[PDB]
Amino acid sequence: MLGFLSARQTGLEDPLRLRRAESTRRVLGLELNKDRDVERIHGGGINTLDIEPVEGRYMLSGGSDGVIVLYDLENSSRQSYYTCKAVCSIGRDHPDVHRYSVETVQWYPHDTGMFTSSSFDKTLKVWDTNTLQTADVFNFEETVYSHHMSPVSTKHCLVAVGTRGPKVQLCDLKSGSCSHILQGHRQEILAVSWSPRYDYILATASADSRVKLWDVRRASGCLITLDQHNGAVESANTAHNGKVNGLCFTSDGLHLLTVGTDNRMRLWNSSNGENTLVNYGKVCNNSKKGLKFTVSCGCSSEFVFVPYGSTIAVYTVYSGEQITMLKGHYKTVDCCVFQSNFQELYSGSRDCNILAWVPSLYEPVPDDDETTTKSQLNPAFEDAWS
């Protein structure tokens, strides 16, 4: 540390280096609930989490109960230990509440005043955050597994919806259009994800074992089908020997991660679909529904956090190296989300907990001359062989 501080003060190293090094060290030090609980509002499993992109203060949660909960993550108490309290909820008393489990919540990418929700009740809903009233509602023939709004598109406001139907659907919130379908897939579409680099490029994953990249401006059909063997454009390509149930672009958009029920994670070049041949080993993935997982941002290494049964596995994206297993939950983890500002990970599970994983690099320090106001050696940490 003191070396980094000296090098920064003297301009020997760019201020980038201390910042990225310490961010990486913090990710390596994640510990369960060290400073922080999250308030138990849900009665069911936590299907989905989304941290607000503007300030990172607020987290939406959706669950198998159909409830949507909005949490405040900032410690506005003066204590070193605190609870992330629920600001407000769309509970079962609300008229517009979802009838069946809520499978994706996403903030509007450009300000916090609106958010979107989807559910196995075959709806996509648009919510006014200040009032928690729906502004628009879209209905579908089939249960929605996933939806996404483009994180970078200013030009268009399209929601991609993946359903049990074989056709991807696109809803235009500006016009209210929901007629536009993409017709290339053959089974249920389990994950959809817009490129963070390009306004118009949508990745889609399906139980047909295919990941397809689309340019939604075109009348032409899809661009690229990912072939895990690298050899041919559509006739037989598969990304996994199983269902493909999760997508995550890397934070630069240059690669796409995919996870599937073959228990493998695979890294792809997003500009042409080449399998980069990074091998992570067995990544346990039994999930028959979409799996949400996340990369880090702003670290010296790009990490990926992936549900691994009841654990969260951490890998280095490019090296394939398994770094740690975060070992908290009692049932399968369904989502995790990364707070980029402070390198804190939140995780939802079918055990109904939301758990915070927080960098725990060192303890509060005593003064040895104190009587009892020290940083206490609690007797729970003591042996008792007598």
Partner: peptide, 25 residues
């Protein structure tokens, strides 16, 4: 307003206004 006070594009308030006007009378 607690939310929408800061931008990270169409502002939420105008997209919401279009959706409301489209769904009300």
């Amino acid at each position: 307003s607690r939310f929408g006070k800061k931008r990270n594009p169409l502002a939420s308030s105008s997209l919401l206004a279009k959706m409301r006007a489209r769904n009300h009378l």
